[PDB]
Point group: none
């Protein structure tokens, strides 16, 4: 029961963020300061994720699917480049100091034109004590985030700006989702697709992924 | 049901090596080329792991246990150089083409004199089919494995063989244990200590480690 899980977590000096159900009988999904963990109902066993549902045609990352709750929770903190005819919606962990992230951003109008809406979350590859984290902190805190992001990528004046957006939250989520390098795309089902793909290749990928997921 | 589990693994291009009931009801501990995975009896869900038994004072790594199980099965294939008076027993992943493995073997008398029993398993850094793997296969397939390893490390040839020994097994397990180079030392509890240490340093290290693990 919950008391057992809490006693086990407390023993390990872990602070439970919330106890959710798991697709496996006998255990729960637990998001903690240490991240997501699976723990048996009796609190006797812990299994580090991720957990995958492999009953279907393709493997689904259930941990990531669950984390989409935390991801969608950051929706207002995302820098969104809306496609006029939104046919696809992807969330991309980006680093303004990454050459490939610049290459992707430079073609944003093409992704948008192909019907792909891009939502950015910050991911400083160099960690929280880096120029990347400071620069993106200022971007996300700007009156106009899109303008600020476009400017910084173009190598312009990154106006000093502060707010309560914590890049550490974006970074932690990305790490938990399995983000290693940038850019990294997160799909609507939680699937992580690390890497850069030009507008055309990307569109086809998104079209095929979708076709081979719903049936 | 191992059956449904193997169908799931196959559809993922993953191969199983050993399947055992897990400490968690409705789950099994599966050793695969992708590491130790925890899969449900119906083969529908896979959890990466490791799994830890936290129903005690300190966490117990179930994955480490599964790996030690494989190591125990390999004891019958280890080349053992026993110390007259056995104070320590270490398992060493060695490569006959490795300069530090040459040195370690050349100092075997000293490790043994210092009470250290050394048990070898093969680990071709250059992978399977390499010249290293081929020669060790010949060594491990010989009547007297000790004499054959000695002869080879001495530059002499050994009566080749086609036995039941497959170096791929040692290699695969080494990889699963975290071995990346040679020589690599594996302690009784599964702790991997990569690298060469001369006899005296190795002895001090093992004594200190044993003291620390026993709280003395």
């Amino acid at each position: 029961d919950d008391a057992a899980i809490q006693q086990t977590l407390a023993k390990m000096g872990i602070k439970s963020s919330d106890i959710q159900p798991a697709p496996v009988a006998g255990m729960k999904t637990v998001l903690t300061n240490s991240g997501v963990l699976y723990i048996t109902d009796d609190g006797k066993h812990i299994i580090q994720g991720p957990m995958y549902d492999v009953s279907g045609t393709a493997p689904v990352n259930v941990t990531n699917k669950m984390l989409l709750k935390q991801l969608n929770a950051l929706e207002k903190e995302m820098i969104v480049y809306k496609a006029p005819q939104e046919k696809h919606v992807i969330t991309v962990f980006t680093d303004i100091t990454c050459g490939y992230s610049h290459k992707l951003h430079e073609q944003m109008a093409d992704y948008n034109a192909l019907g792909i809406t891009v939502r950015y979350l910050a991911f400083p590859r160099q960690g929280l004590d880096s120029d990347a984290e400071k620069e993106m902190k200022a971007i996300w805190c700007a009156k106009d985030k899109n303008k600020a992001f476009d400017d910084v990528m173009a190598g312009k004046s990154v106006a000093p700006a502060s707010c309560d957006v914590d890049i550490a939250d974006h970074y932690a989520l990305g790490v938990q989702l399995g983000v290693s390098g940038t850019p990294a795309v997160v799909l609507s089902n939680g699937t992580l697709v690390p890497g850069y793909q030009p507008p055309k290749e990307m569109k086809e990928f998104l079209d095929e992924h979708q076709k081979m997921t719903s049936g």
